[PDB]
Symmetry: C2
Subunit: 128 residues, 2 copies
């Protein structure tokens, strides 16, 4: 199994994937985010944020409260398993995390915390 | 002996759990849905409908258009892995499905298809 995934967020507020499977043989897993299109970060910025499904709402809400300067993410949010920077068009960011941070049979979600974006920019991650 | 879950939908349009883990050893899994509370089926009816995460939106949208008499579910919808009937207060219904219909490292959701309910009445199902 590949221990990485490449994901795009675009100018239509979409990710190009909404499911990630992480094989238990991976020690680490890398998410490579990019932003095709031409809208800048202050209007259409995207991140990739990974938490338990149960933690997503608090992460998203506290991210909105943290504002654009903090990449719409609460600093040192302990619920965040992995995060990229908030990127604008033509940029890219990668995050690597330890697969040991994923428990078996637990539900994970990934999402963008730019306000409003998680309506569409969300997806599910499991172990395999 | 642990191949079932009890779930409730109430008058506030809430399930009492949003995460189900199915033991990979179970041949069959049973969901026992009940409706505590006081509102009838045509106002606050609930079902338990299981699909892949990817299929939830289409099941929900097509169910809305099917109407109350068809339990707000498209007939013979091949995306539905398991469904209870739509129940009103005091009523109960169970569904048993084959665990073979679930795959590892794949994302399932359960939800109610009564119109509007799935924004609140939804949850994630995984294998352990
Ligand atoms: Cu975004
Ligand atoms: Cu979900
Ligand atoms: Cu309902
Ligand atoms: Na591999």
């Amino acid at each position: 199994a590949e221990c990485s995934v490449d994901i795009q967020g675009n100018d239509q507020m979409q990710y190009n994937t909404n499911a990630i499977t992480v094989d238990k043989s991976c020690k680490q897993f890398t998410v490579n985010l990019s932003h095709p299109g031409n809208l800048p970060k202050n209007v259409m910025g995207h991140n990739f944020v990974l938490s338990t499904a149960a933690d997503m709402q608090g992460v998203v809400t506290d991210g909105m409260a943290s504002g654009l300067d903090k990449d719409f993410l609460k600093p040192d949010d302990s619920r965040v398993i992995a995060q990229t920077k908030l990127i604008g068009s033509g940029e890219k960011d990668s995050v690597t995390f330890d697969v040991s941070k994923l428990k078996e049979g637990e539900q994970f979600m990934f999402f963008c915390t730019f306000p409003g974006h998680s309506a569409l920019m969300k997806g599910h991650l499991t172990l395999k």
